Coordinates of C-alpha atoms in Angstrom, one line a residue:
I1 CA -15.2 -25.0 53.5
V2 CA -13.4 -22.3 55.0
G3 CA -9.8 -23.0 56.8
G4 CA -9.7 -26.7 55.9
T5 CA -7.7 -29.0 54.0
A6 CA -7.9 -31.5 51.1
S7 CA -9.5 -34.8 52.1
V8 CA -8.0 -38.0 51.4
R9 CA -10.0 -40.3 48.9
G10 CA -12.4 -42.5 50.6
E11 CA -12.1 -40.5 53.6
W12 CA -15.6 -39.6 53.8
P13 CA -17.3 -42.3 51.9
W14 CA -21.0 -41.2 52.9
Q15 CA -20.5 -37.9 51.4
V16 CA -22.2 -37.2 48.1
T17 CA -22.4 -34.2 45.7
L18 CA -25.8 -33.4 44.6
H19 CA -25.9 -31.8 41.0
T20 CA -28.7 -30.0 39.1
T21 CA -28.6 -30.3 35.4
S22 CA -30.5 -26.9 35.0
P23 CA -29.5 -24.9 33.3
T24 CA -26.4 -26.8 32.8
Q25 CA -25.1 -29.4 35.2
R26 CA -23.5 -27.9 38.4
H27 CA -22.9 -29.0 42.0
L28 CA -26.0 -27.8 43.9
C29 CA -25.4 -29.2 47.4
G30 CA -23.7 -31.7 49.8
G31 CA -25.4 -34.9 51.2
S32 CA -25.0 -38.1 53.3
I33 CA -25.7 -41.6 52.3
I34 CA -27.6 -43.2 55.1
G35 CA -29.5 -46.1 53.4
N36 CA -29.0 -48.2 50.2
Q37 CA -31.4 -45.7 48.3
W38 CA -31.5 -42.8 50.7
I39 CA -29.6 -39.4 50.9
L40 CA -30.0 -37.0 53.8
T41 CA -29.5 -33.5 52.9
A42 CA -30.8 -29.8 53.6
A43 CA -34.4 -28.9 52.7
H44 CA -33.0 -25.4 51.7
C45 CA -31.0 -27.2 48.8
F46 CA -34.2 -27.7 46.9
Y47 CA -35.4 -23.9 46.4
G48 CA -36.8 -23.5 42.9
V49 CA -36.3 -27.1 42.3
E50 CA -39.7 -28.3 40.7
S51 CA -38.9 -31.9 39.7
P52 CA -36.6 -34.7 41.0
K53 CA -35.7 -35.2 37.3
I54 CA -32.9 -32.5 37.1
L55 CA -31.2 -34.1 40.1
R56 CA -28.1 -36.2 40.1
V57 CA -26.3 -37.6 42.9
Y58 CA -22.5 -38.6 42.7
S59 CA -21.1 -41.0 45.1
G60 CA -17.4 -41.9 45.7
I61 CA -16.2 -38.4 44.5
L62 CA -13.0 -36.6 45.7
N63 CA -12.6 -34.1 42.8
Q64 CA -15.7 -32.6 40.9
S65 CA -13.1 -33.0 37.9
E66 CA -13.7 -36.6 38.1
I67 CA -17.5 -36.1 37.2
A68 CA -18.0 -35.9 33.3
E69 CA -20.9 -36.9 30.9
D70 CA -19.6 -40.3 31.0
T71 CA -19.9 -40.7 34.7
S72 CA -22.5 -42.7 36.2
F73 CA -24.9 -41.5 38.8
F74 CA -28.1 -41.9 41.0
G75 CA -31.3 -40.8 39.6
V76 CA -33.6 -39.1 42.3
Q77 CA -36.9 -40.9 42.5
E78 CA -38.4 -38.6 44.9
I79 CA -37.5 -35.2 47.2
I80 CA -39.1 -35.5 50.6
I81 CA -38.8 -32.3 52.3
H82 CA -39.9 -32.0 56.1
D83 CA -43.6 -30.5 56.2
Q84 CA -42.5 -27.9 58.9
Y85 CA -39.7 -26.6 57.0
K86 CA -40.2 -22.9 55.7
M87 CA -36.3 -21.8 55.7
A88 CA -33.2 -22.4 56.9
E89 CA -32.6 -20.4 59.7
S90 CA -36.3 -21.4 61.0
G91 CA -35.1 -24.8 61.5
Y92 CA -36.4 -28.2 59.9
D93 CA -33.8 -27.8 57.5
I94 CA -33.8 -31.4 56.4
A95 CA -35.0 -33.4 53.4
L96 CA -34.5 -37.0 52.1
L97 CA -33.6 -38.4 48.5
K98 CA -35.0 -41.5 47.7
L99 CA -32.6 -42.8 44.6
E100 CA -34.1 -44.8 41.6
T101 CA -31.6 -47.4 42.3
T102 CA -29.7 -48.7 45.2
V103 CA -26.1 -47.8 46.1
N104 CA -23.8 -51.0 46.1
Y105 CA -21.7 -50.2 49.2
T106 CA -17.8 -50.4 49.1
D107 CA -14.7 -49.0 50.5
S108 CA -15.6 -45.5 48.2
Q109 CA -19.1 -45.4 49.1
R110 CA -20.9 -46.7 52.3
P111 CA -23.7 -45.3 54.9
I112 CA -22.9 -43.1 57.9
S113 CA -25.0 -44.2 61.2
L114 CA -27.4 -41.8 62.3
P115 CA -26.8 -40.6 65.9
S116 CA -28.7 -42.5 68.8
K117 CA -31.0 -40.7 71.3
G118 CA -28.8 -42.2 73.7
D119 CA -26.0 -40.2 72.7
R120 CA -27.7 -36.8 73.2
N121 CA -25.5 -36.7 76.3
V122 CA -22.3 -37.7 74.9
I123 CA -19.7 -35.0 74.2
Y124 CA -18.0 -35.3 70.7
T125 CA -14.6 -33.8 70.5
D126 CA -13.8 -35.2 67.2
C127 CA -16.2 -33.5 64.7
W128 CA -15.4 -32.6 61.1
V129 CA -17.6 -30.7 58.5
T130 CA -16.9 -31.6 54.7
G131 CA -17.9 -30.3 51.4
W132 CA -16.8 -28.7 48.0
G133 CA -18.2 -25.2 49.0
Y134 CA -16.9 -21.6 49.0
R135 CA -13.5 -21.2 51.0
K136 CA -14.1 -17.5 50.9
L137 CA -17.4 -15.4 51.1
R138 CA -17.6 -14.3 47.4
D139 CA -15.8 -17.5 46.0
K140 CA -16.7 -20.5 43.9
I141 CA -17.3 -24.1 44.1
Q142 CA -14.1 -26.2 45.0
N143 CA -12.6 -29.0 42.9
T144 CA -11.1 -31.1 45.8
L145 CA -13.3 -32.0 48.6
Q146 CA -12.5 -30.2 51.7
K147 CA -12.4 -31.1 55.5
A148 CA -12.1 -28.9 58.5
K149 CA -12.1 -30.1 62.2
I150 CA -14.6 -28.1 64.3
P151 CA -15.6 -28.1 68.1
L152 CA -19.2 -28.3 68.9
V153 CA -20.7 -25.4 71.1
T154 CA -23.5 -25.3 73.6
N155 CA -26.9 -24.0 72.2
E156 CA -26.8 -21.4 75.1
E157 CA -23.4 -20.3 73.7
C158 CA -24.7 -20.5 70.2
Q159 CA -27.7 -18.3 70.8
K160 CA -25.5 -15.6 72.6
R161 CA -23.8 -15.5 69.0
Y162 CA -27.1 -15.0 67.3
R163 CA -29.4 -12.3 69.4
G164 CA -31.6 -12.0 66.2
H165 CA -32.3 -15.6 65.7
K166 CA -34.0 -18.4 67.8
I167 CA -31.6 -21.3 68.3
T168 CA -33.6 -24.3 69.0
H169 CA -32.9 -27.6 70.5
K170 CA -33.6 -29.0 67.0
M171 CA -30.3 -27.1 65.8
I172 CA -26.6 -27.5 66.9
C173 CA -23.8 -25.2 66.2
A174 CA -20.1 -25.8 65.8
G175 CA -17.2 -23.1 65.3
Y176 CA -14.0 -21.2 67.0
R177 CA -14.6 -18.2 68.8
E178 CA -12.0 -16.7 66.9
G179 CA -13.6 -18.1 63.6
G180 CA -11.2 -19.3 60.6
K181 CA -12.8 -22.9 60.3
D182 CA -16.4 -23.3 58.9
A183 CA -18.7 -24.3 56.5
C184 CA -19.8 -21.9 53.6
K185 CA -22.1 -21.8 50.6
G186 CA -22.1 -24.9 48.6
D187 CA -21.5 -27.0 51.6
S188 CA -25.2 -26.8 52.6
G189 CA -26.8 -30.2 53.1
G190 CA -23.3 -31.9 53.6
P191 CA -22.7 -33.8 56.9
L192 CA -21.2 -32.7 60.4
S193 CA -19.5 -35.9 61.1
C194 CA -18.5 -36.8 64.6
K195 CA -16.2 -39.9 65.7
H196 CA -16.8 -41.3 69.1
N197 CA -15.5 -44.7 70.2
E198 CA -14.4 -45.5 66.8
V199 CA -17.5 -45.0 65.3
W200 CA -18.8 -42.0 63.0
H201 CA -22.3 -40.8 63.5
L202 CA -24.1 -38.1 61.4
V203 CA -24.4 -35.6 64.1
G204 CA -25.5 -32.6 61.7
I205 CA -26.3 -31.1 58.4
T206 CA -24.4 -28.0 57.4
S207 CA -27.6 -25.5 57.1
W208 CA -26.8 -21.8 57.8
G209 CA -24.6 -19.0 59.5
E210 CA -23.9 -15.5 59.2
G211 CA -21.3 -15.1 56.6
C212 CA -18.4 -18.0 56.9
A213 CA -15.8 -18.4 59.3
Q214 CA -16.4 -15.2 61.1
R215 CA -15.6 -14.4 64.7
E216 CA -18.0 -15.3 67.1
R217 CA -20.5 -16.7 64.4
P218 CA -20.8 -20.4 64.8
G219 CA -21.9 -22.5 61.9
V220 CA -25.5 -23.8 62.4
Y221 CA -26.6 -27.4 61.5
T222 CA -29.7 -29.4 61.8
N223 CA -29.5 -31.6 64.9
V224 CA -30.1 -34.8 63.1
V225 CA -30.8 -36.8 66.5
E226 CA -33.7 -34.9 66.6
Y227 CA -35.2 -36.3 63.6
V228 CA -34.3 -40.0 63.7
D229 CA -37.9 -40.5 64.3
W230 CA -39.0 -38.4 61.5
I231 CA -36.4 -40.3 59.1
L232 CA -37.7 -43.9 60.0
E233 CA -41.3 -43.0 59.4
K234 CA -40.4 -41.3 55.9
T235 CA -38.2 -44.2 54.7
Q236 CA -40.5 -46.9 55.9
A237 CA -42.2 -48.1 52.7

């Protein structure tokens, strides 16, 4: 996250840090708890990942330093990637993680509500992006979870900033015309959380962007509301 600050512990109880143990354990991507054994994240996060066995999901984490060999984690039973996904910039950058065991909800770990199709019209003015990602273009994974408040921009406006791309309605963007605040490498798969009427909804999933926090280069996120049907179909046993 660029231009953000340290989060308060428990401030984003739905945020998880997805690690890979190959070759050695490290943070791989962000993610969101949406159900007792379901994590919503980005599809591009699993490039080169052949098996769910090298994955580990940590919940209730503020600092990566908290994660050690003796820290409990959730194993991943199955990686479900949208069948139309090819790459981040083409859309469909969404994936589900079915955990081997269920998450016991508590103040430090609980689910975020999916957006409602009835809310496509509501306007969010209180949206935040979080993660342990880069704070600069050539940086490293950060220890303390970062947060940054960022305004949503219309798709018409976003498209004007990405003339070489096709910004579809299944994508949503957020950023400051002047830049300064944005998600970045390492934050991928993490949530774009917007609070409306005292309730938080998972509006987007950090997906891509030209560089990070650059002027007139809005961050691009998966428009979650467009996938609520896909999510229901994929999580329904």
